[PDB]
Design a protein around this ligand. Structure first.
Ligand SMILES: CCCCCCCCCCCCCCCCCC(=O)OC[C@H](COP(=O)([O-])OCC(O)COP(=O)([O-])OC[C@@H](COC(=O)CCCCCCCCCCCCCCCCC)OC(=O)CCCCCCCCCCCCCCCCC)OC(=O)CCCCCCCCCCCCCCCCC
Ligand SMILES: CCCCCCCCCCCCCCCCCC(=O)OC[C@H](COP(=O)([O-])OCC(O)COP(=O)([O-])OC[C@@H](COC(=O)CCCCCCCCCCCCCCCCC)OC(=O)CCCCCCCCCCCCCCCCC)OC(=O)CCCCCCCCCCCCCCCCC
Ligand SMILES: Nc1nc2c(c(=O)[nH]1)N[C@H]1C(S)=C(S)[C@@H](COP(=O)(O)OP(=O)(O)OC[C@H]3O[C@@H](n4cnc5c(=O)[nH]c(N)nc54)[C@H](O)[C@@H]3O)O[C@H]1N2
Ligand SMILES: Nc1nc2c(c(=O)[nH]1)N[C@H]1C(S)=C(S)[C@@H](COP(=O)(O)OP(=O)(O)OC[C@H]3O[C@@H](n4cnc5c(=O)[nH]c(N)nc54)[C@H](O)[C@@H]3O)O[C@H]1N2
Ligand code: SF4
Ligand code: SF4
Ligand code: SF4
Ligand code: SF4
Ligand code: SF4
Ligand code: SF4
Ligand code: SF4
Ligand code: SF4
Ligand code: SF4
Ligand code: SF4
Ligand SMILES: [Mo+6]
Lengths: 289, 982, 289, 80
């Protein structure tokens, strides 16, 4: 572990013993998914599985184009389809779903196993499986419901932002494959620029609420979207509006720990000083004099 | 840290996607560095970032190629199924070749026809036929052509018969050639992109990127007109519904709108179309019928469908366009009936939607604005398929969009190499280079050439087909070599002569009557792809022998096997001897394939095929040599034509791709000189242009339009220069396109009569005082601006035809006719003539047609982005993407039938049934047509009884056995069905 | 460890906590050694040591061509020579020896150190030295007597099937070097095909008992042989006939463990409940009443 | 995971075996990318898969060339 010496966050690691991160002068990268240019071809699902050496089961059709129906340990990205008339005419909104590579990841914050989840200087959040204990805390800590457990090895898996390709200078497999160029990749700074240019074009076409989805509640994401209707992200098969780490999780992983620590220390002190101060309670402390 | 990059020391090989005609570039990776001791194995495939069309992208089909190449269903050994057996038996290659050759020789000796009843030598064999592989290389294609014709076969077709045959039948008569006119990247230059009669975002996704580039970055308007709200509609600016089988009404309505509002490029129309030519006084149209109808033969005498002739024998003209008989005025009269109300009443398209489309299209009548049409089967697969296309082509001529960058007619091809097989002539009566086999009435070479060499119909025209003799004699020299001489008419009588066209529906009608002994299915799965599957299986069951050549298990190879409802047959009752021969796939050979834009692209081998699989040329050679040796020692019928065909390859049993590609390009057989005495080519050298071909036996080429593809300068199909100096997306240095590397056909029309570009920001060619030069190779000769020479150089009159004279079977102008199985049971425009009056419908098939009382809904079949026909279901990645068969219906129909989304249903027609999951959606909605509510049931074509996706039913179990009046392409897109809960 | 997430077997790891193996959709590979085409040149020994950066000692000649005389920590493959007349005429049978990369490896089964031996999805069995304690259990667990201890670091080493080359797409060093093509490499499926084709040719030459050596007793191997005399593998310098994991090792590493576990738990329960039930045995339990 | 592939950034040079007349093709690998400040040092040699005669193979002599090139007995200075 830590061979790259650019680990800026590490799960279950005390704040006063930070992970190796001297090689942190690197530009943050990002994937930009422009749903207004997506044709729902699923090429990204196929390219992802092919590159990553994984295959999900052959499922069933239950009335919709969506398939697989959900992310799983063997499907790291899935296209989600939504038909709606909420905006005045029939629209088919199609969105690629998978890890958002949050700047402040809830999965990492909730994880109880040291080093099971890490965040690289470039923004990629990845699972170091040797340390995963299969507790599933990360599934609840994630504001986007992304981590998935593999029944065959009790470990979670998800989109790695093709860390094995990016680490040596190549863009992710899904990015490269996208037929229409709905998916873009590069430094986050220039992806934000491309996103704003696209939003301007959508507004010029009549989408007054077009916008970039890069949620401040999780510190921004390294997988962002350009949405025709940024005022209604739920329309895109439940994309959360203003996502953030849940308050109960923040308290549980935050203040509860040192509070409990103080109680324990204080209790031990009290009991110890108590025994010593007063002495045992035996049958006769009186005939001892 | 992250796992190491898995391809760092793998062998990288360049190849091309094997599925659709976009022609995306691939980079395949194999385990092993090429050393002899390491057997290469492809383990990953992704896109080639430098390819100009795909730029690294691959749709779900291309991206999942690994799972096809390594499919668990790849064929490994020659297998044989005995008469009445329920199992395969593995045999050796030598056993397969000997058994097949013996069966073929016995049948050919028994049924070969040397002379016809009128005493003419015809040398034809009709009792054994072949289906050819549009998914295989051009080199395999030429070997197949030589194999089939030298044996005298006329029942020889490739997928074109059930696909774009109607396009060739309509665009050739209208513009001069049947091919897609522009190319993929060029679509980015459009101002309006029309997707009608196709679903490009699902059927040609990577190519569709350029339509999205036009929309997003060129401010173009994307319009989709389809009975379903598709994934292309998802990104469209405008969506308008239309009832299947009514396109001619919608498009004729557009023509009426343009003419009435004078939204045309007048100077373009006046000079580049036949608008000013005068039509014979006896030409007429009334109540659904044109003049010359013979109601008993159900065909037209087309004598009146012609131009009036002047004193010099050329077409008479009236440049003022005021004469009542000029094409322009007759066109105006013909489309006057197609008002917006008529369009709404027949098509179901609301007037407000139709108006939006008319207005946007009309905005491109300006010289500097263009519309480009992207279409395919939505228009071709109808009894009026060719006429659907005629109407759209006429629209593009009125708007002045042909020959323009960002304009044209992009008739999107299907299979990766259907373009190549069409080019090479693997169609019943065709020869390579759009040449034609002799008909049995053409008793000698002179008669044959005269019938195929058109006389110019206006003075000062290029009329390039006048060169037909040079192409034909050169083809004969390629086929026969020294055996073809002036003395024996270049081997003229060795070619089979036709008495009629042996299209697939006709041939299966013959098979059903017991007239067909054997059949070859090379990369073609008719049990899945032909109409009326129950009848198809019944027909194949009458065959004595069948030979399947494929890299995968196919439903056709196992048609004799019981698969429950999916294929309820009794093996014991089927006596057919079936041979299944394992072939290579695209990744296991080098060779070339032609994409939709006419680009011949070379690809390289990445690994050896699994087991004992052999390449297509080796398989043909094995059978061919065994067969010819039998003739050498036994004699037989039709010996000479078979033995004279050349097979001049260094290793006769293993022809190499470069050898065949060079034959296609052509050679100089003697030193050649120009008229000034200058040497143009030396004996033995490859030719650089078809302009150098001669009719005196000194040149050879097995495909004249391919001359220039592999010259003394090398294999041009391997060129990889993606430079685009003009910024228009034209890359003359990548691969090689026919003809003579011209990327945009009809480009002389990109400029006005004075040679000035219609749009100065899109100059393709220009006059420099002595020749035409520019950003594309001129599809023109050296006629100076201002001369009478027309821009459509393959047309005898040099013009785009608004009036198609005597070329179309059902009329010189398109006319609305209902599908054979229509939900209305009548035709609102003329109840006396409901469907196409020249459609051919065999009695046996007429008995299998249903009526609206029993089958009230419109049935239509189409594709999903994730699968390719019934091929990709053999690949795990694609099976995961769309695992189970479904059909699409509206919320209205589902509610009426009590069907909840996801429920199982049974869809049926007069011919059979299928059962599937129901996808209930607002994307399908009933339309108001002629006072009724018309519902459509959509049936995707990807599932069946072989593969790794969930078992399903062949969609063609439902389709009607009837086709286009010109090409006999099946009406797969508009028929009748019923639905019930299951 | 587990960075490749395709570890299908791991030494000393409880069956209910399997190693990371989500990326398991990969074709199995295999080396095929056709001894009927081998010329005993030893090029494979040289190429192996050169590629792997190891050098054995300069030994002695004791009367045979074989040298080194045995596999060692510094010689991962050795050619073994046998002269015989057992089949009717003089034959010189030469066989390349080294790890067989068993589908069910006895070394891994016998190893007591977690993660010291692993098996990849593609069939390669490799030693992860950081976890090796030098006990040597693997030497006895191996049906082919392959593992060898390095005196200089107390760890075992053997043929890695050039995992460092195969992992990135290149065939092993010995495979590539073989002068006559006696050694082949590729997917196991196609190597089995090549093996059967070769066996057919040998039979056509008069070797009626020619066959493929891919022992079912160890689940098949990823290094296989084509033998002229498959009915007599011992002729090839002791190649085992019908090899399998030894019965004593299977019992020791199998049933003995849970049995002992039950005894321990049951004993602890008994003793504890015994003390509590009856109480101490002190000098006088009687004058306590 | 496995040790990284040791030749990924080495300079690759084509040469021919120095021993017998078969003439097997070689691909030699040197430490250094050819920059003037790096003194190249061959550290691995294997066969050239594209050579028509050898097709990547090398016998024990060709396969061991590294130990000849870097032999402890290489001559270094003129001696008298
Ligand atoms: C008088 C009142 C005294 C009040 C003092 C309050 C101290 C709070 C310290 C801390 O939490 O600040 C944390 C501070 C902030 O950390 P953070 O990254 O924001 O979050 C912490 C982690 O997220 C998650 O939390 P954490 O895992 O990092 O917890 C930290 C701490 C955790 O340890 C503790 O909090 C206290 C230990 C409690 C153990 C409970 C044992 C109970 C089990 C008994 C069951 C018996 C069964 C019956 C049968 O571990 C270490 O710091 C070393 C402490 C070692 C104690 C060894 C005692 C052995 C004695 C034997 C003789 O960490 C530290 O600065 C070093 C703390 C040093 C304390 C001295
Ligand atoms: C009433 C009769 C009750 C019968 C119950 C029988 C249970 C057998 C369980 C098992 O072997 O199935 C194994 C099963 C199958 O594993 P496998 O992969 O086929 O093979 C096992 C490994 O190959 C090789 O074996 P293994 O290494 O995986 O052994 C498993 C087990 C191993 O642990 C045991 O088997 C029992 C522990 C015995 C310790 C011996 C201490 C003796 C030393 C004293 C020396 C004193 C010196 C005097 C001076 O370790 C863990 O499962 C956690 C057990 C933790 C016990 C903690 C006690 C601390 C109390 C302090 C207050 O593993 C498990 O399902 C979880 C077992 C949970 C048991 C509760
Ligand atoms: N994903 C994928 N790609 C393919 C293929 C594949 O199997 N799968 N096959 C390749 C081949 S061989 C070809 S020929 C192409 C064809 O590609 P296309 O013809 O574009 O594709 P289809 O899906 O057959 O359907 C065309 C569209 O026409 C609509 N339609 C149905 N009836 C009518 C009608 O009468 N009028 C109009 N205007 N529309 C109608 C359908 O709803 C459908 O969306 O696809 C190629 N590309
Ligand atoms: N209902 C309905 N029917 C249709 C259509 C429709 O829209 N609806 N569309 C029609 C059209 S446009 C078409 S193109 C057909 C296609 O239908 P088909 O072409 O019959 O079907 P495919 O599944 O594409 O299979 C062709 C074969 O090529 C094999 N092949 C791959 N590479 C090679 C090779 O190099 N050599 C050999 N020998 N074989 C190879 C593939 O494995 C596959 O088995 O379907 C048609 N039928
Ligand atoms: S590959 Fe691109 S276009 Fe296709 S579904 Fe994924 S994001 Fe959308
Ligand atoms: S999306 Fe979920 S899994 Fe991904 S980085 Fe954010 S919190 Fe973690
Ligand atoms: S399941 Fe999640 S939370 Fe639990 S150890 Fe593994 S990564 Fe951490
Ligand atoms: S970035 Fe890589 S891991 Fe993530 S979805 Fe795309 S292809 Fe899969
Ligand atoms: S199917 Fe067509 S669009 Fe998809 S990758 Fe292949 S060639 Fe490209
Ligand atoms: S290199 Fe090949 S021929 Fe030489 S001894 Fe080894 S296996 Fe035998
Ligand atoms: S041969 Fe021995 S060392 Fe090699 S994998 Fe098999 S049991 Fe383990
Ligand atoms: S010597 Fe063998 S058995 Fe012992 S820890 Fe090392 S690998 Fe395991
Ligand atoms: S496969 Fe690699 S480690 Fe094994 S013997 Fe061959 S060269 Fe040595
Ligand atoms: S590698 Fe061996 S056979 Fe080849 S040239 Fe060198 S000594 Fe000769
Ligand atoms: Mo097609």
């Amino acid at each position: 572990a830590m061979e790259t010496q650019d680990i800026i966050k590490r799960s279950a690691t005390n704040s006063i013993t930070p992970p190796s991160q001297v090689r942190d002068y690197k530009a943050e990268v990002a994937k930009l998914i422009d749903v207004s240019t997506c044709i729902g071809c699923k090429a990204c699902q196929v390219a992802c599985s092919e590159w990553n050496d994984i295959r999900d089961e052959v499922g069933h059709c239950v009335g919709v184009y969506d398939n697989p129906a959900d992310l799983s340990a063997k499907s790291w990205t899935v296209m989600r389809f939504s038909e709606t008339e909420q905006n005045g005419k029939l629209e088919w909104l199609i969105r690629k779903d998978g890890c958002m590579h949050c700047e402040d990841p809830g999965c990492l914050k909730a994880c109880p196993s040291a080093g099971a989840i890490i965040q690289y200087a470039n923004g990629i959040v990845d699972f170091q499986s040797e340390n995963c204990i299969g507790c599933g805390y990360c599934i609840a800590g994630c504001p986007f419901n992304i981590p998935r457990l593999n029944k065959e090895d009790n470990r979670v898996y998800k989109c790695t932002l093709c860390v094995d390709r990016v680490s040596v200078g190549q863009e992710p497999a899904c990015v490269k494959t996208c037929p229409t160029g709905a998916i873009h990749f590069g430094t986050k700074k220039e992806m934000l620029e491309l996103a704003e240019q696209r939003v301007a074009k959508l507004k010029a076409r009549g989408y007054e609420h077009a916008g970039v989805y890069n949620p401040e509640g999780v510190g921004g994401t390294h997988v962002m979207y350009v949405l025709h209707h940024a005022d209604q992200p739920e329309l895109y098969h439940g994309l959360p509006k203003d996502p953030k780490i849940d308050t109960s999780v923040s308290l549980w992983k935050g203040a509860l720990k040192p509070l409990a620590a103080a109680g324990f220390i204080a209790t031990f002190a009290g009991l110890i000083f108590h025994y010593i101060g007063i002495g045992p309670n035996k049958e006769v402390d009186d005939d001892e004099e | 840290q992250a796992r190491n990059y898995k391809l760092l020391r793998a062998k990288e090989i360049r190849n091309t996607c094997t599925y659709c005609s976009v022609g995306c570039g691939l980079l395949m990776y194999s385990l092993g560095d090429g050393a002899k001791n390491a057997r290469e194995a492809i383990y990953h495939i992704e896109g080639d970032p430098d390819h100009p069309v795909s730029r690294g992208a691959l749709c779900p089909k291309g991206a999942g190629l690994l799972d096809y190449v390594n499919s668990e269903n790849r064929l490994r050994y020659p297998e044989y199924r005995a008469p009445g057996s329920d199992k395969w038996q593995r045999i050796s290659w030598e056993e397969a070749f000997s058994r097949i050759a013996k069966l073929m020789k016995a049948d050919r000796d028994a049924n070969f026809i040397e002379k016809n009843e009128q005493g003419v030598t015809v040398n034809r064999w009709l009792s054994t036929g072949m289906l050819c592989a549009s998914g295989a290389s051009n080199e395999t294609g030429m070997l197949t052509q030589k194999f089939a014709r030298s044996l005298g076969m006329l029942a020889v077709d490739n997928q074109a018969r059930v696909x774009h045959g109607p396009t060739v039948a309509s665009l050739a008569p209208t513009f001069g050639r049947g091919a897609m006119t522009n190319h993929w990247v060029d679509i980015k230059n459009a101002n309006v992109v029309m997707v009608m009669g196709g679903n490009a975002a699902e059927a040609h996704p990577v190519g569709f990127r350029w339509a999205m580039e036009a929309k997003n970055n060129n401010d173009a308007t994307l319009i989709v007109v389809d009975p379903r709200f598709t994934r292309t509609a998802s990104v469209a600016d405008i969506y308008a519904p239309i009832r299947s089988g009514t396109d001619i009404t919608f498009l004729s309505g557009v023509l009426r709108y343009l003419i009435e509002n004078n939204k045309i490029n007048a100077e373009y129309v006046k000079h580049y179309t036949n608008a000013s030519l005068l039509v014979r006084d006896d030409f007429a149209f009334e109540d659904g019928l044109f003049s010359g109808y013979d109601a008993e033969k159900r065909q037209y005498d087309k004598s009146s469908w012609n131009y009036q002739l002047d004193e010099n024998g050329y077409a008479k003209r009236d440049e003022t366009l005021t004469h009542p008989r000029c094409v322009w005025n007759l066109l105006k009269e013909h489309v006057s009936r197609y008002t917006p109300d008529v369009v709404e009443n027949i098509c179901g398209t609301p007037k407000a939607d139709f108006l939006k489309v008319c207005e946007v299209l009309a905005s491109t009548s300006a010289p500097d604005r263009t519309t480009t049409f992207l279409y395919a089967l939505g228009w071709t697969q109808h009894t009026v398929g060719a006429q659907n296309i005629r109407t759209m082509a006429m629209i593009q001529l009125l708007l002045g969009n042909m020959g323009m960058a960002g304009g044209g007619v992009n008739a999107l091809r299907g299979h990766s190499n259907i373009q190549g097989l069409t080019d090479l002539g693997l169609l019943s009566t065709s020869l390579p280079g759009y040449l034609t086999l002799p008909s049995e009435k053409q008793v000698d070479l002179q008669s044959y050439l005269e019938a195929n060499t058109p006389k110019a119909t206006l003075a000062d025209q290029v009329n390039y087909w006048s060169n037909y003799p040079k192409f034909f004699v050169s083809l004969m020299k390629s086929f026969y070599g020294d055996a073809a001489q002036k003395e024996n008419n270049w081997g003229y009588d060795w070619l089979p002569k036709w008495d009629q066209t042996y299209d697939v529906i006709k041939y299966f009608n013959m098979m059903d009557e017991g007239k067909v002994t054997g059949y070859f299915c090379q990369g073609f799965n008719p049990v899945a792809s032909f109409p009326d599957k129950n009848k198809v299986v019944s027909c194949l069951s009458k065959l004595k022998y069948m030979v399947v050549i494929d890299p995968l298990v196919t439903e056709t190879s196992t048609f004799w096997q019981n698969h429950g409802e999916s294929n309820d047959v009794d093996p014991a009752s089927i006596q057919t001897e079936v041979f299944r021969l394992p072939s290579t796939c695209f990744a296991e050979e080098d060779g070339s394939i032609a994409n939709s834009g006419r680009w011949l692209q070379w690809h390289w081998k990445g690994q050896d095929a699994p087991g004992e699989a052999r390449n297509d040329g080796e398989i043909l050679a094995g059978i061919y040599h065994h067969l010819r040796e039998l003739y050498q020692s036994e004699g037989g019928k039709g010996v000479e034509p078979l033995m004279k065909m050349s097979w001049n390859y260094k290793q006769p049993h293993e022809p190499q791709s470069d050898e065949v590609a060079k034959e296609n390009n052509g050679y100089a057989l003697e030193d050649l000189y120009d008229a000034n005495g200058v040497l143009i080519a030396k004996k033995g050298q490859l030719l650089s242009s078809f302009a150098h071909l001669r009719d005196d036996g000194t040149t050879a080429s097995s495909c004249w339009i391919y001359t220039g593809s592999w010259t003394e300068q090398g294999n041009q199909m391997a060129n990889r220069d993606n430079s685009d100096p003009s910024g228009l997306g034209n890359t003359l240095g990548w691969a090689w396109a026919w003809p003579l590397n011209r990327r945009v056909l009809y480009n002389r029309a990109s400029a006005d009569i004075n040679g000035k570009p219609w749009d100065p920001k899109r100059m393709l060619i220009q006059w420099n005082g002595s020749k035409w030069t520019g950003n594309d190779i001129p599809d023109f000769g050296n006629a100076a601006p201002g001369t009478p020479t027309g821009p459509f150089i393959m047309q005898p009159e040099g013009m785009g035809r608004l009036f198609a004279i005597n070329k179309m079977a059902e009329g010189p102008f398109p006319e609305h006719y209902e599908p054979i199985e229509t939900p209305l049971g009548t035709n609102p425009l003329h109840p006396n003539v409901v469907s196409n009056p020249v459609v051919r419908l065999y009695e046996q098939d007429a008995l299998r047609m249903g009526k609206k009382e029993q089958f009230p809904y419109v049935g239509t079949t189409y594709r999903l982005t994730e699968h390719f026909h019934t091929w990709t279901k053999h690949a795990l990645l694609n099976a995961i993407a769309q695992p189970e068969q479904f059909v699409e219906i509206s919320e209205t129909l589902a509610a009426a039938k009590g069907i909840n989304n996801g429920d199982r249903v049974t869809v049926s027609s007069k011919r059979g049934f299928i059962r599937a999951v129901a996808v209930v959606t607002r994307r399908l909605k009933p339309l108001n047509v002629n006072g009724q509510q018309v519902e459509t049931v959509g049936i995707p074509i990807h599932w069946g009884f072989e593969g790794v996706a969930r078992k399903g039913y062949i969609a063609n179990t439902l389709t009607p056995n009837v086709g286009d009046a010109n090409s006999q392409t099946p009406e797969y897109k508009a028929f009748l069905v019923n639905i019930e809960k299951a």
